[PDB]
Subunit: 92 residues, 4 copies
Amino acid sequence: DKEFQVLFVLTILTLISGTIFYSTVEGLRPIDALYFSVVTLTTVGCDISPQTDFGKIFTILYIFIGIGLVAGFIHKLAVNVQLPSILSNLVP
Amino acid sequence: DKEFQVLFVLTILTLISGTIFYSTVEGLRPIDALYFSVVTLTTVGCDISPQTDFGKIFTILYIFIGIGLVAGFIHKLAVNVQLPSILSNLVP
Amino acid sequence: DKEFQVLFVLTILTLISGTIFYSTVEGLRPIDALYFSVVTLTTVGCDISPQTDFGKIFTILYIFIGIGLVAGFIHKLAVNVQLPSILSNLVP
Amino acid sequence: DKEFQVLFVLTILTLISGTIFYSTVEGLRPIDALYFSVVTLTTVGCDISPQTDFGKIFTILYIFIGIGLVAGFIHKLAVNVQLPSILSNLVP
Ligand SMILES: [Cs+]
Ligand SMILES: [K+]
Ligand SMILES: [K+]
Ligand SMILES: [K+]
Ligand SMILES: [K+]
Ligand SMILES: [K+]
Ligand SMILES: [K+]
Ligand SMILES: [K+]
């Protein structure tokens, strides 16, 4: 499934970029920076906000450019990969 | 309505898993753990974040795997079960 | 536009119910209770969480039953009512 | 691509309006006011809430009127402008 892999690669790259940015500029531990990237792009959010003007501007751009991609990835992780499995049982 | 029941079962199982995980690893009361699972997977969020690295990693995986499912469930709870009722009045 | 009015009425009723519930059980001012209802059902969220077990259970049910409705309402407020206006200028 | 530009213009105007409102009434720095507008309309949210009744009422209206628009803009920024680029490599 190429599109799955493609959306996966772009998401991975997006999250790597976010992890690097927030670990460097906002000073988060790598794991916390990946968490922040993930909850931002899925719109889940969390209890902290960037506190540098650079972090705020980057987050604005990051959100606008990443939400669509991660939403597409979540969609296919659910429908091209998850739906079939569901049918694997509910029909004999 | 099979698909409704199926989405319902998978959602229940997802939420049970989350309740168990967050009550065990993050140490939340069962009710708070279910709340956290629910607001996470609907992307509503809340004022607390996991504070163990295990909780953060699990939440990343949980979000990615659960959002699609709960969104589908919410869709059908609204359209295969809620829309008809609406027509039950607005047309004689 | 009937469906607009219908989605509007159901949303109003949903928000009224939320305002009453959160002003009574969580003890919020009416305006804060309406804010909480609105940011919950649009998944925007805010910096506070219900602190009674009754408020948490109600919010779980409220979210599951209301998000679909408000999403439909937001969709039509944007497409059956907002899109035409946009065309009102960008084409002579 | 006209629709892209149109959605872009309406989004810019929406965000400008939010920046002005929150910098004036809630007293946020311009950059923080734009951040608040952006995380509100993308439903990402943040760790602060308006504290004037005027800010709460405006945010209710702002959300209802803006979410649809920004969602459409995010969609096209991802599909009319981002998808082609993706094909630019994954096919020779
Ligand atoms: Cs959120
Ligand atoms: K901050
Ligand atoms: K959200
Ligand atoms: K929050
Ligand atoms: K934390
Ligand atoms: K959302
Ligand atoms: K609380
Ligand atoms: K506040």
